[PDB]
């Protein structure tokens, strides 16, 4: 499972944050699997049927409104019939108000649930029409609803591979030109941020390299002598803990491999990937962020 290099998403300035124009909060949430992210979107094909999409949105809203109206009318008729029955029986006004309040609260709940569905659809439509890369979705339920409903245009996954795909699909020269154009203008406040981002991007471009070096797939290990192995009177292992950290990383990778072979739902696999990322970050550096291992 691809991982990220601790020296970047935690560094100040965080090279990833500037290059990918993401706040540290969002980047760290993405890395440790806290919220999904929209990688790429074919906005054109959605625009070509944006009117048709709005039309189907309207008709589904009409259908939900229609079932809502059916329920409201049925319950209002039931309540009115109950009130007429109670009047015929000549019961006290206390019973009248009790039944009336019960029915009114039931209808308020029905309308509130209908408005729940309506605002859910409105959020879906807003986040669908008003959608672009680098967007976040904190709640998993909303993302599940999006993919189930509109799983055609935008592809979004949470994890290091997400960043890798985003950066490799991303281009540098266009952003460099846009930042240069912004700098050519004024507005010091945003101009300084533009200057910093342009500096980073120009360094990337001049380096002749690619940002893909910020997501690792194969960590190396130093020779054995550099981590000398020591035998005590009882032959105990008390040498540099480098062996301990490599043990942890290898053990967790093998657990990942075995688990993915066996098959299991997304929750366990994602948790396990997070644990692996934690171990690699610890090995490249202990105590950089969070509680150091002891």
């Amino acid at each position: 499972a691809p991982v990220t290099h601790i020296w970047y998403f935690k560094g100040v300035p965080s090279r990833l944050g500037y290059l990918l124009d993401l706040a540290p909060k969002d980047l760290e949430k993405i890395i440790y699997f806290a919220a999904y992210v929209i990688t790429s979107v074919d906005e054109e094909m959605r625009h070509n049927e944006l009117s048709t999409l709005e039309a189907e949105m309207a008709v589904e809203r009409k259908a939900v409104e229609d079932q809502r109206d059916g329920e409201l009318e049925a319950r209002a008729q039931k309540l009115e019939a109950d009130l007429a029955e109670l009047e015929a029986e000549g019961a006290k006004a206390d019973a009248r108000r009790k039944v009336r309040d019960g029915g009114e609260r039931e209808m308020r709940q029905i309308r509130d649930r209908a408005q729940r569905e309506l605002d859910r659809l409105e959020d879906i439509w807003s986040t669908f029409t008003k959608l672009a890369p680098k967007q976040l979705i904190v709640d998993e339920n909303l993302y599940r609803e999006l993919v189930d409903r509109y799983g055609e245009y935008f592809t979004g996954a949470m994890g290091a591979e997400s960043i890798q795909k985003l950066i490799e699909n991303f281009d540098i020269d266009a952003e460099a030109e846009s930042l240069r154009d912004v700098i050519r203008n004024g507005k010091g406040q945003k101009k300084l941020r533009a200057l910093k981002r342009l500096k980073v991007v120009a360094a990337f471009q001049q380096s002749g390299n690619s940002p893909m070096g910020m997501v690792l797939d194969a960590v190396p290990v130093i020779p054995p002598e550099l981590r000398p192995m020591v035998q005590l009177d009882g032959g105990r292992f008390a040498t540099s803990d480098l062996n301990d950290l490599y043990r942890r990383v290898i053990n967790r990778n093998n657990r990942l491999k075995r688990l993915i072979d066996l098959g299991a739902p997304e929750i366990i696999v994602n948790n396990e990937k997070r644990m692996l990322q934690e171990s690699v970050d610890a090995l490249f550096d202990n105590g950089r962020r969070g509680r150091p291992v002891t």
Partner: peptide, 10 residues
């Protein structure tokens, strides 16, 4: 540490 340290004898 993934830092490709070349020599550039040239």
């Amino acid at each position: 540490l993934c830092l490709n340290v070349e020599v550039l004898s040239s």
